[PDB]
Design a protein around this ligand. Structure first.
Ligand code: SAN
Ligand code: SAN
Ligand code: SAN
Ligand code: SAN
Ligand code: CL
Ligand code: CL
Ligand code: ZN
Ligand code: ZN
Ligand code: ZN
Ligand code: ZN
Lengths: 226, 225, 225, 226
């Protein structure tokens, strides 16, 4: 029900804040995502482990014209700030939205969670090119190739198998990276990348047809914790 | 920007609607002040905040919202490796920030701007105790009427108002008065300094009302300690 | 092991030479107690030390070196993921540890052993203030003569002696009495608890002398905070 | 002037504490080195950067029958606990003395420093097999091949070039790893390894003729900071 937006032309990221009054934060926000994570500038901090309690409740995969998204049943959760944030969906960007020390990864997954009070936590996972990713291949095998199309998953999705083994992370306070770019979003960005094959990357690039990362936004007053 | 205050239909709950320019007061999710729950704050390797103040006070002003000492902007603190220049300091009673749900009777804000206009506020809490000598210099020329500036009669050394121990809480927040712009660095010192009850009462009476904004939800933020 | 004490030719400086068994008192480089300089201590992600004590006091003994409450060893704390069982607790005046070069008037040590004989000591500082109810139960049966045990007349709840805030300094050290064995985990709580001046004075008079070992050099160690 | 010791037989590490009363700490010490560094058990902490102010004041290389050691003039220093510890010598062990998560590296360098008050700080650098190490090759080219022999260095030694680029470290309180195994030694163990070629490793192994690492010792009451 929100105004139409995209990644280029008159509806691209530089214009989002003018597409609708609902999208104001895109242009006036000072706590926007994604960001560059400069590891030296980040603050070493006593960050609590982010406990993962996922379940295999995937409903379908959808190509919504902005990403490839797996929609979940909402029963699995992570624990952040002692609260349960339930896994609602995960989706993908290429190139990465976040950068580390000024460099992109070729691909980034976002696991989007909602607590019962309506607050959002996103877990970000970077991918590098290497070995074929078995869990990703379950989704890729049935990737809808046109926008507006959804497909049944033919294999049981285990979302935790997409996360890195090492669970060290960067944390900061940010926003959604797509309109309305609402703030008050908790970001948990895992430091260790996972792997996907070049073929998997190129399938995503070909199906999408364009890059779908928002440009990095100024840190402003924020510190990233590490 | 419209007239605003601390009670009635122009009080803090109404701010965001008084002018479109004040919208962040209502819609922002990284607003100040906050309650600082010490147990919930995250232990972090925070850099010392070095202070290089000079005695460049220009005047004291009662602007109807606070008593404010305006500076020449030559002194500075170092935050994130950058110089933030001390433009003014001013006061609130009761405190704006709380610690573990409790107010201090009084809080001072030292407001700094870097060369690109980014704002850093250093907050100092005060408790009732011995008369504060440095504060006494400002109080001796406190203008009793809003809209009046008075010249200082003594040399102001702003660093003498800060606590001796320089450990602090840090978080990202906002200005505490309209337009409540975000992108503000907050450095809140953990150790309070003392003022006499008479110094406190003079401020309370000259203001004529409490001038603290209610604490705002932390939302996605952590406080570092 | 030879007779040792807190003054004359059997005092702390002479300990290491009284018996070959006491050599570490003299040659060890990770000895306790220490001065805890808070500014020098390293901020660290220290695990909470969970306390699971039970009321299993057996007796109070004056052993000529301290007043000690001997426990049944059923209660425990969790340190490094392991259970360390509370064997006894005892007292020193003035404090053994100092903080920023200052003593507290009194310090309690809660001595624990894991299943393999590794020792963890929890230290609690006391300041003069209100009479301590839990300490009063022990004091009511304090044996006045060395070599005497007395039974308790009230149920001892040792956790009631610990401060409410459980934040602590940690370092690796030694026993503070001969043979001053190393390999001892020290958990020193930052917040003091209160005792009356009369409770303090009773202990000082029953002992008849100061029973604190002088602080020892940190050498290669850091204190975590 | 101390009693003769070695790495095997009746004079090996299990016997060091009985070889001389001077070596007592080898058998009774509870703060001995080297150790296993379990990264999960280590405590994340606000460790100060260890500033390096080395100079090229190498005097000679020596094969002393226990290691290959480069002896320095003592003018270069590192800063630890706000004090200058001067670089006196550096030397090598294979396999590594320290282990990380129960695993050895094939080689470890130790840079030994002395403050003016007589306190020792050792910086440890792990090596893995990979590319030929240019700074190490300056020493290796003139490695004395028999115990008791010293040789002139034919190239200017720059000791800082042996340290890893990333200067993150583990710190703990320990001992010398050779008799007398004196305690009160500050250990700074860099987390990131550097590389040496297989040929460089095998030259060291061949010249030494035996492994020269002391077995790891119990952590006891200690925490390692990271
Ligand atoms: N609704 C929504 C959820 C997550 C994101 S993202 N790309 O920031 O994770 C954007 C919109
Ligand atoms: N301009 C301005 C400066 C500082 C503050 S305060 N009250 O947050 O320090 C508010 C407005
Ligand atoms: N055995 C023993 C137990 C504890 C201590 S103390 N004083 O270090 O707690 C000394 C000896
Ligand atoms: N003297 C000496 C210095 C350093 C070491 S070592 N191997 O622990 O660095 C041993 C002895
Ligand atoms: Cl946290
Ligand atoms: Cl340090
Ligand atoms: Zn996304
Ligand atoms: Zn203010
Ligand atoms: Zn004791
Ligand atoms: Zn060595």
């Amino acid at each position: 029900g929100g105004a139409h937006w995209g990644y280029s032309g008159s509806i691209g990221p530089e214009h989002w804040g003018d597409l609708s009054p609902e999208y104001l934060m895109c242009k006036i926000g000072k706590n926007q995502s994604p960001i560059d994570i400069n590891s030296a500038d980040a603050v070493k901090a006593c960050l609590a482990p982010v406990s993962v309690y996922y379940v295999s409740d995937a409903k379908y995969v959808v190509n919504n014209g902005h990403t490839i998204k797996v929609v979940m049943g909402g029963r699995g959760y992570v624990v952040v700030d002692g609260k349960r944030f339930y896994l609602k969906q995960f989706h993908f960007h290429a190139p990465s939205e976040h950068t580390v020390n000024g460099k992109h990864y070729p691909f980034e997954a976002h696991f989007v969670h909602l607590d019962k009070n309506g607050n959002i936590t996103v877990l970000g996972v970077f991918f590098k090119v290497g070995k074929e990713n078995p869990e990703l291949e379950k989704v890729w095998r049935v990737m809808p190739e046109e926008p507006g199309q959804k497909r049944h998953l033919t294999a049981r999705i285990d979302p935790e198998k997409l996360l890195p083994e090492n669970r060290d992370y960067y944390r900061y306070s940010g926003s959604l990276t797509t309109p309305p770019c609402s703030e008050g979003v908790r970001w948990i960005v895992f430091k260790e990348p996972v792997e996907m094959s070049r073929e998997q990357l190129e399938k995503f690039r070909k199906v999408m047809g364009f890059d779908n990362n928002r440009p990095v936004q100024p840190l402003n007053a924020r510190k990233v914790m590490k």
